Amino acid sequence: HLPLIAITRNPVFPRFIKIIEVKNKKLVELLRRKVRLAQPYVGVFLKRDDSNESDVVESLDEIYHTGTFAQIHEMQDLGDKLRMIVMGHRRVHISRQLEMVEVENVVHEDFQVTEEVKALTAEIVKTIRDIIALNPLYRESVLQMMQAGQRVVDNPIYLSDMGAALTGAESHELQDVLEETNIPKRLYKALSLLKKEFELSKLQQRLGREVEEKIKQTHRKYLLQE
Amino acid sequence: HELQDVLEETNIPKRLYKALSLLKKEFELSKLQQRLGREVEEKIKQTHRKYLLQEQLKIIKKELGLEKDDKDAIEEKFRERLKELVVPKHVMDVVDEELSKLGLLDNHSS
Amino acid sequence: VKALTAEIVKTIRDIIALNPLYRESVLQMMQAGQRVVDNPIYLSDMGAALTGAESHELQDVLEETNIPKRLYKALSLLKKEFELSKLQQRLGREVEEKIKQTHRKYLLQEQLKIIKKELGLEKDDKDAIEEKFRERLKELVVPKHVMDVVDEELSKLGLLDNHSS
Amino acid sequence: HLPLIAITRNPVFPRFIKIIEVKNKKLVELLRRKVRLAQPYVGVFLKRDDSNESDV
Amino acid sequence: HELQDVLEETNIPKRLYKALSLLKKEFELSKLQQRLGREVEEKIKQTHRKYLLQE
């Protein structure tokens, strides 16, 4: 029974550390009111299209039904007065956020036979390796800690979510991947997100090499003219 | 576990045949996945080429090296300057071609 | 009393690293951890030789009689050179980054044009005008003497860009 | 006659160079004690279903 | 022509000597072009670097 938080353009992918710094100070009152608790926590929800902070505080239907509840780790507040840490621990698809009642309706069907189902996983981490190699966003040390050979991925859905966090897909798209209920549908959608980034990247790369070689063809003949 | 089972076999034809059978099943799994993924990839390819050309359009727009604001202001300014005049055709077409030249050129060339 | 020497040799290594004047092999021959500095006055003088300080300054360093005073003055000289070196280095990177921001932004703008040059590769102007001249030309009982020029000039029009004078 | 190594989800196929990086520091004492040994060696084995380091 | 001339030679040390001479003669021409190219490039560096100084 806490008011929804004003996410204000802050996606919290499952099992991916994130920070929330809302500019309003009315949310700090709620963050300071939970410091008396022995186990403080915060919930994370996603916003709908045409974001609006005034509608988030006026009505509670703007926020999507999906939520990722988690516990806070620790406040720092070095520069601003609202530096909260968020995490994706318990995913949820609230039946009605307006009513607040909640239930962990985390559907997760998976085949018993997990032999053919991990061959695509090899391609997912390979696509992540090519996405971080051709489009490096974050460090590769997390990939060396959590290896493929060394099967220490106790939560594959979470590893896929952490890998999908590298995707540049719109927040809406993330909600759409969460909307998918079957596990192979969301898995292919995550792969689709990767491909959508991949197409643009390849376009940019071809365009860049083309312009650069044109510059080389320019200047090299100028060296010849010299 | 499967590796240990393949190692338990002592005779060479037995382990070789078991290894090949294991290769057959693994290749069958990888093939069905590669085909299902090709089908899904085709279902993603179903998105129209207009969207791709729209992507190139937004790529053009989302840049900080596009048409000069100063030139656009002069462009509209001279257009409104002509808006009300009983303009002869000669000056009209010459003004239009020169305005294109204005759009093309850099903001500091003489 | 030997604590100042450690900062003097670290500053001299930073002076030859950021402003390399002479080789560092003399610095490895006479190091501070192998009991190879039998003459500190001489080592300070040799270290002070790397300085670019004015002759006047050298005389000023000689005026000092006490050892920590001349060492401190030598340090002041070191700071004067260090100040000049860091100024030049920052200044150089600044000018170069201005050049990079120049050319790089031109690379982006160049990309913008190239992709907005042949966005639709249909010669909406070049071809329409050449074909236009052709049908307008088609019906006349033309001299062949002119056809040579018109066709080669058609090729030149196919080469040149539209905006060009 | 050496204690079993804590493979910890690391398959070492025969005649295939492999690297082992256990997080525990208890295996380094045995690795430092075999450098002084005349013949330095280590054995590699495979684990059964449902891996468990406490059972190893 | 030179290849045929090397074939005309019958002794083995004569063709070997000519082959070495052929190799050096081409190398000499190559090196002349290479020296000229690096020289032109160094001239360009001395050009532009002074422009960096003037700027």
Coordinates of C-alpha atoms in Angstrom, one line a residue:
Chain A
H1 CA 0.0 0.0 0.0
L2 CA 2.5 2.6 -1.2
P3 CA 2.0 5.1 -4.0
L4 CA 3.5 4.3 -7.4
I5 CA 6.9 5.7 -8.0
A6 CA 7.5 8.3 -10.7
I7 CA 9.9 6.2 -12.7
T8 CA 10.6 9.1 -15.1
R9 CA 12.5 7.4 -17.9
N10 CA 14.3 4.7 -15.9
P11 CA 14.1 1.1 -17.2
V12 CA 15.0 -1.6 -14.6
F13 CA 15.8 -4.8 -16.6
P14 CA 15.5 -8.0 -14.5
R15 CA 18.8 -8.6 -12.6
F16 CA 20.5 -5.4 -13.8
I17 CA 21.5 -2.8 -11.2
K18 CA 19.9 0.6 -11.9
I19 CA 19.7 4.0 -10.3
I20 CA 16.6 6.2 -10.0
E21 CA 17.0 9.9 -9.5
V22 CA 13.5 11.5 -9.6
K23 CA 13.7 15.3 -9.5
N24 CA 10.6 15.6 -7.3
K25 CA 11.1 15.6 -3.5
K26 CA 7.7 14.1 -2.6
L27 CA 9.2 10.7 -3.4
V28 CA 12.0 11.3 -1.0
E29 CA 9.4 11.5 1.8
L30 CA 8.4 8.0 0.9
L31 CA 12.0 6.8 0.7
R32 CA 12.8 8.3 4.2
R33 CA 9.5 6.9 5.6
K34 CA 10.8 3.4 4.8
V35 CA 14.2 3.9 6.5
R36 CA 12.5 3.0 9.8
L37 CA 11.8 -0.5 8.4
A38 CA 14.4 -3.2 9.1
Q39 CA 14.2 -4.5 5.5
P40 CA 13.5 -1.5 3.3
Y41 CA 12.3 -2.1 -0.3
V42 CA 11.0 -0.4 -3.4
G43 CA 8.9 -1.4 -6.3
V44 CA 9.6 -0.7 -10.0
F45 CA 7.0 -0.4 -12.6
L46 CA 7.1 0.7 -16.2
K47 CA 5.4 3.8 -17.7
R48 CA 3.1 3.8 -20.7
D49 CA 3.3 5.8 -24.0
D50 CA 3.3 9.6 -23.8
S51 CA 5.0 9.8 -20.4
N52 CA 3.6 12.4 -18.0
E53 CA 4.7 12.9 -14.4
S54 CA 1.5 14.8 -13.5
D55 CA -0.7 11.9 -14.6
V56 CA 1.5 9.5 -12.7
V57 CA 0.7 11.4 -9.5
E58 CA -2.9 12.2 -10.5
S59 CA -4.0 8.8 -11.7
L60 CA -2.5 5.3 -11.2
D61 CA -3.5 3.7 -14.5
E62 CA -0.7 5.3 -16.6
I63 CA 1.9 3.0 -15.1
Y64 CA 1.9 -0.5 -16.7
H65 CA 0.6 -3.5 -14.8
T66 CA 4.1 -5.1 -14.9
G67 CA 6.3 -4.5 -12.0
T68 CA 9.7 -5.6 -10.8
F69 CA 9.7 -5.4 -7.0
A70 CA 13.0 -5.4 -5.2
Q71 CA 14.9 -4.4 -2.1
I72 CA 16.9 -1.3 -1.8
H73 CA 20.6 -1.8 -1.2
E74 CA 21.9 1.6 0.1
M75 CA 21.5 5.3 -0.4
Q76 CA 24.4 7.5 -1.2
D77 CA 23.0 10.9 -2.3
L78 CA 26.4 12.4 -3.2
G79 CA 25.1 15.3 -5.3
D80 CA 21.3 15.1 -5.4
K81 CA 19.0 14.4 -2.5
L82 CA 17.3 11.4 -4.3
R83 CA 19.9 8.8 -5.4
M84 CA 18.1 5.5 -5.0
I85 CA 19.3 2.1 -6.2
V86 CA 16.8 -0.2 -7.9
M87 CA 17.1 -3.8 -9.0
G88 CA 15.0 -6.4 -10.8
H89 CA 14.4 -9.2 -8.4
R90 CA 10.7 -10.2 -8.3
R91 CA 8.9 -9.7 -11.6
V92 CA 5.2 -9.3 -11.4
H93 CA 2.2 -8.6 -13.7
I94 CA -0.2 -7.0 -11.3
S95 CA -3.8 -7.8 -12.0
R96 CA -5.0 -4.3 -11.1
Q97 CA -2.5 -1.7 -9.8
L98 CA -5.5 0.6 -9.0
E99 CA -6.8 -1.8 -6.4
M100 CA -2.5 -2.1 -3.6
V101 CA -3.2 -5.8 -4.1
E102 CA -0.5 -7.8 -5.9
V103 CA 0.4 -11.4 -6.7
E104 CA 3.5 -13.1 -8.1
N105 CA 2.0 -14.4 -11.4
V106 CA 5.4 -15.1 -12.8
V107 CA 4.6 -17.6 -15.6
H108 CA 7.7 -19.5 -16.7
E109 CA 7.0 -22.7 -18.7
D110 CA 10.1 -24.5 -20.0
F111 CA 10.7 -27.9 -21.6
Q112 CA 12.0 -30.7 -19.3
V113 CA 14.5 -31.6 -22.1
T114 CA 17.0 -28.8 -22.0
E115 CA 19.4 -30.1 -24.6
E116 CA 18.1 -28.6 -27.8
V117 CA 16.9 -25.5 -25.9
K118 CA 20.4 -24.4 -25.0
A119 CA 21.7 -24.5 -28.6
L120 CA 20.0 -21.1 -29.2
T121 CA 21.4 -20.0 -25.9
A122 CA 24.9 -20.4 -27.4
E123 CA 23.8 -18.1 -30.2
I124 CA 22.3 -15.6 -27.7
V125 CA 25.6 -15.2 -25.9
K126 CA 27.4 -15.2 -29.2
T127 CA 25.1 -12.5 -30.5
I128 CA 25.8 -10.6 -27.2
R129 CA 29.5 -11.1 -27.8
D130 CA 29.2 -9.7 -31.3
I131 CA 27.0 -6.9 -30.1
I132 CA 29.5 -5.9 -27.4
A133 CA 32.3 -6.4 -29.9
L134 CA 30.9 -4.4 -32.8
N135 CA 28.9 -2.1 -30.6
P136 CA 30.6 -2.1 -27.2
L137 CA 28.4 -0.7 -24.5
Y138 CA 29.5 -2.2 -21.2
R139 CA 32.5 -4.2 -19.9
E140 CA 33.1 -7.8 -20.9
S141 CA 34.3 -8.8 -17.4
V142 CA 30.7 -9.8 -16.4
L143 CA 30.8 -12.3 -19.3
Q144 CA 34.1 -13.8 -18.1
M145 CA 32.7 -14.2 -14.6
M146 CA 29.5 -15.9 -15.9
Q147 CA 31.0 -18.3 -18.5
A148 CA 29.2 -20.6 -20.9
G149 CA 31.5 -23.6 -20.5
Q150 CA 31.3 -23.2 -16.7
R151 CA 27.5 -23.7 -16.4
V152 CA 27.0 -21.3 -13.4
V153 CA 23.8 -19.7 -14.9
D154 CA 21.4 -20.8 -12.2
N155 CA 18.8 -18.4 -13.7
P156 CA 18.9 -18.5 -17.5
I157 CA 15.9 -16.2 -17.9
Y158 CA 17.8 -13.6 -15.8
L159 CA 20.9 -14.1 -17.9
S160 CA 18.9 -13.5 -21.0
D161 CA 17.3 -10.4 -19.4
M162 CA 20.8 -9.1 -18.5
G163 CA 21.8 -9.8 -22.1
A164 CA 18.7 -8.1 -23.4
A165 CA 19.5 -5.1 -21.3
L166 CA 22.3 -4.3 -23.7
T167 CA 19.6 -4.0 -26.4
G168 CA 18.7 -0.4 -27.4
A169 CA 15.0 -1.3 -27.9
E170 CA 12.4 1.2 -26.7
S171 CA 11.0 0.9 -23.2
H172 CA 7.6 0.1 -24.9
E173 CA 9.4 -2.8 -26.6
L174 CA 10.6 -4.1 -23.2
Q175 CA 7.1 -4.0 -22.0
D176 CA 6.1 -5.9 -25.1
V177 CA 8.7 -8.6 -24.4
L178 CA 7.3 -8.8 -21.0
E179 CA 3.7 -9.0 -22.4
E180 CA 4.7 -12.3 -24.2
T181 CA 3.8 -15.1 -21.9
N182 CA 5.4 -18.1 -23.6
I183 CA 9.1 -18.4 -23.0
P184 CA 10.1 -19.1 -26.6
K185 CA 8.1 -16.1 -27.8
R186 CA 9.8 -13.7 -25.5
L187 CA 13.1 -15.4 -26.2
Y188 CA 12.7 -14.9 -30.0
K189 CA 11.4 -11.3 -29.3
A190 CA 14.6 -10.7 -27.3
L191 CA 16.6 -12.1 -30.3
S192 CA 14.4 -9.9 -32.5
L193 CA 15.4 -6.9 -30.5
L194 CA 19.0 -7.8 -30.9
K195 CA 18.5 -8.1 -34.7
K196 CA 16.7 -4.8 -34.8
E197 CA 19.7 -3.1 -33.3
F198 CA 22.0 -5.2 -35.5
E199 CA 20.4 -4.0 -38.8
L200 CA 20.9 -0.3 -37.9
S201 CA 24.4 -1.0 -36.7
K202 CA 25.4 -2.7 -40.0
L203 CA 23.8 0.3 -41.9
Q204 CA 25.9 2.7 -39.9
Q205 CA 29.1 0.7 -40.4
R206 CA 28.7 0.4 -44.1
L207 CA 28.0 4.1 -44.4
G208 CA 31.1 4.9 -42.3
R209 CA 33.5 2.7 -44.3
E210 CA 32.1 4.1 -47.5
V211 CA 32.7 7.7 -46.5
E212 CA 36.1 6.9 -45.1
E213 CA 37.3 5.1 -48.3
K214 CA 36.0 8.1 -50.3
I215 CA 38.2 10.3 -48.2
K216 CA 41.1 7.9 -48.8
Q217 CA 40.5 8.0 -52.5
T218 CA 40.5 11.7 -52.3
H219 CA 43.6 12.3 -50.3
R220 CA 45.6 9.4 -51.8
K221 CA 45.4 10.9 -55.2
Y222 CA 46.2 14.2 -53.7
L223 CA 49.4 12.6 -52.4
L224 CA 50.0 11.4 -56.0
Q225 CA 49.4 14.9 -57.2
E226 CA 51.9 16.1 -54.7
Chain B
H1 CA 27.0 -37.7 -18.1
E2 CA 26.9 -38.6 -21.8
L3 CA 30.6 -38.1 -22.1
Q4 CA 31.2 -40.6 -19.2
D5 CA 28.8 -43.0 -20.9
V6 CA 30.7 -42.7 -24.2
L7 CA 34.0 -43.3 -22.2
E8 CA 32.5 -46.5 -20.6
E9 CA 32.4 -48.2 -24.0
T10 CA 35.6 -50.2 -24.4
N11 CA 35.5 -51.5 -28.0
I12 CA 36.5 -49.0 -30.6
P13 CA 33.6 -49.6 -33.0
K14 CA 31.1 -49.3 -30.1
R15 CA 32.4 -45.9 -29.0
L16 CA 32.8 -44.7 -32.6
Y17 CA 29.3 -45.7 -33.4
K18 CA 27.9 -44.2 -30.2
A19 CA 29.8 -41.0 -30.8
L20 CA 28.4 -40.8 -34.4
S21 CA 24.9 -41.4 -33.1
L22 CA 25.4 -38.6 -30.5
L23 CA 26.7 -36.4 -33.3
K24 CA 23.5 -37.3 -35.3
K25 CA 21.2 -36.3 -32.5
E26 CA 23.1 -33.1 -31.7
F27 CA 23.2 -32.1 -35.3
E28 CA 19.5 -32.8 -35.6
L29 CA 18.7 -30.5 -32.6
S30 CA 21.0 -27.7 -33.9
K31 CA 19.4 -28.1 -37.4
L32 CA 15.8 -27.9 -36.2
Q33 CA 16.8 -24.8 -34.1
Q34 CA 18.6 -23.2 -37.0
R35 CA 15.5 -23.8 -39.2
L36 CA 13.0 -22.6 -36.6
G37 CA 15.2 -19.5 -36.0
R38 CA 15.4 -18.9 -39.8
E39 CA 11.6 -19.1 -39.8
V40 CA 11.3 -16.6 -36.9
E41 CA 13.9 -14.4 -38.6
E42 CA 11.8 -14.5 -41.8
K43 CA 8.8 -13.5 -39.6
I44 CA 10.8 -10.5 -38.4
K45 CA 11.9 -9.9 -42.1
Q46 CA 8.1 -9.6 -42.8
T47 CA 8.4 -5.9 -41.6
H48 CA 8.0 -3.7 -44.6
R49 CA 10.8 -1.9 -46.4
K50 CA 9.0 1.4 -45.9
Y51 CA 10.0 1.1 -42.3
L52 CA 13.6 0.7 -43.3
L53 CA 13.4 3.8 -45.6
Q54 CA 11.7 5.5 -42.7
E55 CA 14.6 4.5 -40.5
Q56 CA 17.0 6.1 -43.0
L57 CA 14.8 9.2 -42.8
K58 CA 15.0 9.4 -39.0
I59 CA 18.7 8.8 -39.2
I60 CA 18.9 11.8 -41.4
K61 CA 16.9 13.8 -39.0
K62 CA 18.6 12.6 -35.8
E63 CA 21.8 14.4 -36.5
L64 CA 23.5 17.7 -35.6
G65 CA 24.9 18.4 -39.0
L66 CA 21.7 19.0 -41.0
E67 CA 20.3 22.1 -42.7
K68 CA 21.5 25.4 -41.1
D69 CA 18.9 27.2 -39.0
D70 CA 20.2 30.5 -40.3
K71 CA 19.8 29.5 -43.9
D72 CA 16.2 28.2 -43.2
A73 CA 15.4 31.6 -41.7
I74 CA 16.7 33.5 -44.7
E75 CA 14.9 31.0 -46.9
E76 CA 11.6 31.6 -45.4
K77 CA 12.4 35.3 -45.1
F78 CA 13.0 35.8 -48.8
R79 CA 10.0 33.6 -49.7
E80 CA 7.7 35.7 -47.6
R81 CA 9.4 38.7 -49.2
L82 CA 8.3 37.3 -52.6
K83 CA 4.9 36.2 -51.2
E84 CA 3.0 39.4 -52.1
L85 CA 4.9 40.7 -55.1
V86 CA 3.6 40.4 -58.7
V87 CA 6.7 38.4 -59.5
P88 CA 7.9 37.8 -63.1
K89 CA 8.8 34.2 -64.0
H90 CA 12.4 35.0 -64.7
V91 CA 13.2 36.1 -61.2
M92 CA 11.0 33.4 -59.7
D93 CA 12.9 30.4 -61.2
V94 CA 16.2 32.1 -60.7
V95 CA 15.4 32.7 -57.1
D96 CA 14.3 29.1 -56.6
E97 CA 17.5 27.7 -58.1
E98 CA 19.6 30.1 -56.1
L99 CA 17.7 29.2 -53.0
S100 CA 18.6 25.5 -53.6
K101 CA 22.1 26.7 -54.0
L102 CA 21.7 28.5 -50.7
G103 CA 20.6 25.3 -49.0
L104 CA 23.5 23.4 -50.4
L105 CA 26.2 25.7 -49.4
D106 CA 28.1 26.0 -46.2
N107 CA 27.4 29.0 -43.9
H108 CA 30.8 30.7 -44.3
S109 CA 31.9 30.4 -48.0
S110 CA 32.4 33.7 -49.8
Chain C
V1 CA 67.2 15.1 5.4
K2 CA 67.0 12.6 2.5
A3 CA 63.2 12.9 2.2
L4 CA 63.5 15.9 -0.1
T5 CA 65.8 14.0 -2.5
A6 CA 63.0 11.4 -3.1
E7 CA 60.6 14.2 -4.3
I8 CA 63.4 15.8 -6.3
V9 CA 64.2 12.6 -8.2
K10 CA 60.5 11.9 -8.7
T11 CA 60.0 15.4 -10.0
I12 CA 63.1 15.0 -12.3
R13 CA 61.7 11.8 -13.6
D14 CA 58.5 13.5 -14.2
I15 CA 60.3 16.4 -16.0
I16 CA 62.1 14.0 -18.3
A17 CA 59.0 11.9 -18.8
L18 CA 56.7 14.9 -19.6
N19 CA 59.4 17.0 -21.1
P20 CA 62.1 14.6 -22.2
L21 CA 65.4 16.5 -22.7
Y22 CA 68.1 13.9 -22.0
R23 CA 68.3 10.2 -21.8
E24 CA 67.2 8.4 -18.6
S25 CA 70.2 6.0 -18.6
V26 CA 72.2 8.4 -16.5
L27 CA 69.2 8.4 -14.0
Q28 CA 69.4 4.6 -13.8
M29 CA 73.2 4.6 -13.4
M30 CA 72.9 7.0 -10.4
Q31 CA 69.8 5.7 -8.6
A32 CA 68.6 6.5 -5.0
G33 CA 68.4 2.8 -3.8
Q34 CA 71.8 1.3 -4.6
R35 CA 74.2 3.5 -2.5
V36 CA 75.5 5.1 -5.7
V37 CA 75.0 8.8 -4.7
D38 CA 78.3 9.5 -2.9
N39 CA 78.1 13.2 -3.8
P40 CA 74.6 14.6 -3.3
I41 CA 75.8 18.2 -4.1
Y42 CA 77.0 16.8 -7.4
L43 CA 73.8 14.8 -8.1
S44 CA 71.7 17.9 -7.4
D45 CA 73.9 19.9 -9.8
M46 CA 73.6 17.2 -12.5
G47 CA 69.9 17.1 -11.9
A48 CA 69.7 20.9 -12.0
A49 CA 71.5 20.7 -15.4
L50 CA 68.3 19.4 -17.0
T51 CA 66.6 22.6 -16.1
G52 CA 66.1 25.3 -18.9
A53 CA 66.5 28.1 -16.3
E54 CA 68.3 31.3 -17.2
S55 CA 72.0 31.8 -16.5
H56 CA 70.9 34.4 -13.9
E57 CA 68.9 31.6 -12.2
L58 CA 72.0 29.4 -12.1
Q59 CA 73.9 32.1 -10.4
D60 CA 71.0 32.6 -8.0
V61 CA 71.1 28.9 -7.1
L62 CA 74.8 29.2 -6.5
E63 CA 74.2 32.1 -4.2
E64 CA 72.5 29.8 -1.7
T65 CA 75.0 28.3 0.7
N66 CA 72.9 26.0 2.8
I67 CA 72.0 22.6 1.2
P68 CA 68.2 22.6 1.7
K69 CA 68.0 26.2 0.5
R70 CA 69.7 25.5 -2.8
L71 CA 67.6 22.3 -3.1
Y72 CA 64.4 24.3 -2.6
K73 CA 65.6 26.9 -5.2
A74 CA 66.4 24.1 -7.6
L75 CA 62.9 22.8 -7.0
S76 CA 61.5 26.3 -7.8
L77 CA 63.4 26.1 -11.1
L78 CA 62.0 22.7 -11.7
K79 CA 58.5 24.1 -11.1
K80 CA 59.2 26.9 -13.5
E81 CA 60.1 24.4 -16.3
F82 CA 57.3 22.1 -15.3
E83 CA 54.8 25.0 -15.6
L84 CA 56.0 25.7 -19.1
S85 CA 55.9 22.1 -20.1
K86 CA 52.3 21.5 -18.9
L87 CA 51.2 24.7 -20.4
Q88 CA 52.5 23.7 -23.8
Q89 CA 51.1 20.1 -23.6
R90 CA 47.6 21.2 -22.6
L91 CA 47.7 23.9 -25.2
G92 CA 48.7 21.5 -27.9
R93 CA 46.0 19.0 -27.1
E94 CA 43.5 21.8 -27.0
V95 CA 44.4 23.0 -30.5
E96 CA 44.4 19.5 -31.8
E97 CA 41.0 18.7 -30.3
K98 CA 39.7 21.8 -32.0
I99 CA 41.0 20.4 -35.2
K100 CA 39.4 17.0 -34.5
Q101 CA 36.1 18.5 -33.6
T102 CA 36.4 20.4 -36.9
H103 CA 37.2 17.6 -39.2
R104 CA 35.1 15.0 -37.3
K105 CA 32.0 17.2 -37.5
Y106 CA 32.8 17.5 -41.2
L107 CA 32.9 13.8 -41.4
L108 CA 29.4 13.6 -39.9
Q109 CA 28.2 16.3 -42.2
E110 CA 29.8 14.5 -45.1
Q111 CA 28.0 11.4 -44.2
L112 CA 24.8 13.3 -44.0
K113 CA 25.2 14.6 -47.5
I114 CA 26.4 11.4 -49.1
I115 CA 23.4 9.6 -47.8
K116 CA 21.2 12.6 -48.8
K117 CA 22.9 12.9 -52.2
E118 CA 21.9 9.7 -53.8
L119 CA 19.1 8.9 -51.4
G120 CA 17.0 8.1 -54.4
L121 CA 19.4 7.4 -57.3
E122 CA 17.2 8.3 -60.1
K123 CA 18.8 11.5 -61.7
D124 CA 15.6 13.4 -61.2
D125 CA 17.3 16.5 -62.7
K126 CA 20.3 15.3 -64.8
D127 CA 18.3 12.8 -66.8
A128 CA 15.1 14.8 -67.2
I129 CA 17.0 17.7 -68.6
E130 CA 19.2 15.6 -71.0
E131 CA 16.2 13.6 -72.3
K132 CA 14.4 16.9 -72.6
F133 CA 17.0 18.3 -74.8
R134 CA 17.1 15.2 -76.8
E135 CA 13.4 15.1 -77.8
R136 CA 13.6 18.8 -78.4
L137 CA 16.5 18.1 -80.6
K138 CA 15.0 14.9 -82.2
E139 CA 13.0 16.4 -85.0
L140 CA 15.4 18.9 -86.5
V141 CA 17.5 17.9 -89.5
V142 CA 20.6 18.5 -87.5
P143 CA 24.1 19.0 -88.8
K144 CA 26.3 16.1 -87.8
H145 CA 28.9 18.8 -87.0
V146 CA 26.7 19.7 -84.0
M147 CA 25.9 16.2 -83.0
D148 CA 29.5 15.5 -82.1
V149 CA 29.4 18.4 -79.5
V150 CA 25.8 17.7 -78.3
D151 CA 26.6 14.1 -77.5
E152 CA 29.9 14.7 -75.8
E153 CA 28.4 17.5 -73.9
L154 CA 25.5 15.2 -72.9
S155 CA 28.2 13.0 -71.4
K156 CA 29.7 16.0 -69.6
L157 CA 26.3 16.8 -68.2
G158 CA 26.0 13.3 -67.1
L159 CA 29.3 13.7 -65.2
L160 CA 28.7 17.0 -63.5
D161 CA 26.5 17.7 -60.5
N162 CA 23.4 19.8 -60.9
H163 CA 24.0 22.7 -58.6
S164 CA 27.5 23.3 -60.1
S165 CA 27.9 26.6 -61.9
Chain D
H1 CA 47.7 -40.6 -4.4
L2 CA 46.5 -37.0 -4.5
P3 CA 43.1 -35.7 -3.4
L4 CA 40.5 -35.2 -6.0
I5 CA 40.4 -31.8 -7.6
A6 CA 37.3 -29.6 -7.3
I7 CA 36.4 -29.5 -11.0
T8 CA 33.5 -27.2 -10.2
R9 CA 31.6 -27.3 -13.6
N10 CA 34.7 -27.6 -15.8
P11 CA 34.9 -30.5 -18.4
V12 CA 38.4 -31.4 -19.5
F13 CA 38.1 -33.6 -22.6
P14 CA 41.1 -36.0 -23.1
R15 CA 43.9 -34.4 -25.2
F16 CA 42.4 -31.0 -25.1
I17 CA 44.2 -28.2 -23.3
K18 CA 42.1 -26.6 -20.6
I19 CA 42.4 -24.0 -17.8
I20 CA 41.0 -24.4 -14.3
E21 CA 40.1 -21.4 -12.2
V22 CA 38.5 -22.4 -8.9
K23 CA 37.3 -19.5 -6.7
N24 CA 38.4 -21.3 -3.5
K25 CA 42.0 -20.8 -2.2
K26 CA 42.2 -24.3 -0.7
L27 CA 43.5 -25.9 -3.9
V28 CA 46.6 -23.6 -4.1
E29 CA 48.2 -25.2 -1.1
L30 CA 48.4 -28.5 -2.9
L31 CA 49.6 -26.9 -6.1
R32 CA 52.4 -25.1 -4.2
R33 CA 53.4 -28.4 -2.4
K34 CA 53.9 -30.2 -5.7
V35 CA 56.3 -27.7 -7.1
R36 CA 58.9 -29.0 -4.6
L37 CA 58.0 -32.6 -5.6
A38 CA 60.3 -34.4 -8.0
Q39 CA 57.5 -35.1 -10.6
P40 CA 54.8 -32.3 -10.7
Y41 CA 51.4 -33.6 -11.7
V42 CA 47.7 -33.2 -11.1
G43 CA 44.7 -35.5 -12.0
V44 CA 41.4 -34.6 -13.6
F45 CA 38.2 -36.4 -13.1
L46 CA 34.5 -35.9 -14.1
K47 CA 31.4 -35.3 -11.9
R48 CA 28.1 -37.1 -11.8
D49 CA 24.6 -35.6 -12.0
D50 CA 23.5 -32.9 -9.6
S51 CA 26.8 -31.2 -8.9
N52 CA 27.5 -30.3 -5.3
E53 CA 30.8 -28.9 -4.0
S54 CA 30.1 -30.0 -0.4
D55 CA 29.7 -33.6 -1.6
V56 CA 33.0 -33.4 -3.6
Chain E
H1 CA 64.4 -9.9 -73.7
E2 CA 66.5 -10.2 -70.5
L3 CA 64.8 -13.5 -69.6
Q4 CA 65.7 -14.9 -73.0
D5 CA 69.2 -13.6 -72.5
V6 CA 69.5 -15.4 -69.2
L7 CA 68.3 -18.5 -71.1
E8 CA 71.0 -17.9 -73.7
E9 CA 73.6 -18.2 -71.0
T10 CA 74.7 -21.8 -70.7
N11 CA 77.0 -21.8 -67.7
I12 CA 75.4 -22.0 -64.3
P13 CA 77.4 -19.3 -62.5
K14 CA 76.9 -16.8 -65.4
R15 CA 73.1 -17.1 -65.2
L16 CA 73.3 -17.1 -61.4
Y17 CA 75.4 -13.8 -61.6
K18 CA 73.0 -12.3 -64.1
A19 CA 70.0 -13.3 -62.0
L20 CA 71.5 -11.6 -58.9
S21 CA 72.2 -8.5 -61.1
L22 CA 68.7 -8.5 -62.4
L23 CA 67.3 -8.7 -58.8
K24 CA 69.5 -5.8 -57.6
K25 CA 68.7 -3.7 -60.7
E26 CA 65.0 -4.0 -60.1
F27 CA 65.5 -3.4 -56.4
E28 CA 67.4 -0.2 -57.2
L29 CA 64.6 1.2 -59.3
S30 CA 62.1 0.2 -56.6
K31 CA 64.2 1.9 -53.9
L32 CA 64.5 5.1 -56.0
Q33 CA 60.7 5.3 -56.3
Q34 CA 60.3 4.5 -52.6
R35 CA 62.8 7.1 -51.4
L36 CA 61.1 9.7 -53.6
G37 CA 57.7 8.8 -52.1
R38 CA 58.8 8.8 -48.5
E39 CA 60.6 12.1 -49.2
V40 CA 57.4 13.6 -50.6
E41 CA 55.6 12.4 -47.6
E42 CA 58.1 14.0 -45.2
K43 CA 57.8 17.2 -47.2
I44 CA 54.0 17.0 -46.5
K45 CA 54.7 16.5 -42.8
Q46 CA 57.1 19.4 -42.7
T47 CA 54.4 21.4 -44.5
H48 CA 51.4 20.6 -42.3
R49 CA 53.3 20.5 -39.1
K50 CA 54.4 24.1 -39.5
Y51 CA 50.8 24.8 -40.2
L52 CA 50.0 23.3 -36.8
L53 CA 52.6 25.6 -35.3
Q54 CA 51.2 28.6 -37.1
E55 CA 47.7 27.8 -35.9

